């Protein structure tokens, strides 16, 4: 496969190839005939930003140190490889690339969200451009999963994370696809300590972890995944006379945090990111402060408990095919 942690990703020219690929890149997405918006997640800013910080990590570590980190090397493989799928995609229908509901766009604006979080992972397994060797999993129960299992391990394959969250959490064979495109978030076959803190963050708590994912990702009408603060206003705008109608996101800026959107009783739209708080929480609380209300605007009341406490029985009647 494409995407491995053996060393010979890193060395003396590492920095050299993830500056070509970037500019070559940059060049492309230059176009001001390009309607690309600033918003995140925002292209050229991520690839500035990522060749930026594989720059720093290789001035402050040297090459001895760098060459045989299975989480580097297989960093610098996705980057330029996804460089190199990026730079296909312009290439093919360069004048389609610039309809901006073409399906090349539409791949286009998937793969910045990848770039997004390949910084984001980048820059917590590698903080301030050192390797995190005492990396801290925020929930006490994944940490402790992940220390028991893995160690000090930085990055582990998913085929051998597979059988460990069907043996521990009740995870079955036919999830594993729908659980690895929610999970490996930087699409590259691996998870990192991080993506596992982003995850475990997400869908805590921790006892209830693949039904919460199963409920909350996968079959309430809330859910919105990766959109933006105006895709959540412009949703809701159409809501402004039922308030309680809500939906909930998540923020390529603050990977690991829900953010959820509602009407209030007076008609107001409000955004906020909940502070310390579960999303199950978060959602429970809502329910009972009356704010959260008609999950996307639909008149269907939600017994999130109820839906948990379901989730292992209807996880079962859903087939192979339906993933
Ligand atoms: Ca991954």
């Not at 998870?191 to 803190?197: A, G, I, L, R, T």
């Not at 579960?278 to 008149?299: C, F, H, I, M, T």
């Amino acid at each position: 496969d494409l995407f491995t942690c053996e060393p010979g990703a890193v060395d003396a020219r590492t920095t050299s190839r993830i500056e070509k690929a970037t500019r070559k890149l940059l060049t492309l997405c230059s176009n001001k005939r390009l309607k690309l918006k600033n918003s995140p997640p925002y292209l050229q800013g991520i690839l500035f930003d990522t060749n930026d910080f594989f720059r720093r990590i290789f001035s402050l570590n040297t090459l001895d140190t760098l060459r045989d980190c299975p989480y580097l090397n297989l960093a610098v493989r996705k980057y330029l490889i996804h460089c190199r799928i990026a730079t296909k995609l312009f290439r093919d229908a360069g004048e389609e690339m610039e309809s901006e509901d073409s399906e090349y766009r539409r791949q286009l604006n998937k793969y910045t969200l990848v770039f997004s979080h390949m910084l984001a992972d980048l820059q917590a397994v590698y903080k301030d451009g050192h390797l995190d060797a005492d990396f801290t999993i925020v929930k006490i129960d994944a940490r402790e999963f992940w220390h028991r299992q893995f160690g000090k391990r930085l990055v582990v394959p998913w085929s051998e994370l597979v059988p460990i969250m069907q043996a521990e959490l009740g995870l079955s064979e036919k999830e594993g696809p729908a659980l690895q495109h929610t999970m490996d978030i930087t699409e590259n076959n691996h998870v990192s300590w991080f993506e596992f803190d982003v995850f475990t963050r997400l869908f805590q708590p921790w006892s209830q972890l693949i039904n919460n994912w199963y409920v909350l990702a996968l079959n309430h009408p809330a859910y919105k995944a990766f959109i933006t603060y105006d895709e959540v206003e412009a949703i809701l705008r159409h809501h402004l006379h039922r308030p309680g109608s809500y939906v909930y996101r998540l923020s390529c800026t603050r990977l690991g945090q829900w953010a959820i959107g509602f009407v209030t009783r007076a008609g107001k739209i409000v955004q906020t990111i909940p502070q310390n708080k579960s999303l199950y929480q978060a959602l429970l609380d809502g329910v009972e402060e009356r704010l959260y209300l008609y999950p996307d605007g639909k008149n269907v009341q939600l017994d999130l408990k109820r839906m948990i406490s379901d989730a292992p029985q209807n996880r079962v009647q859903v087939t192979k095919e339906e993933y």
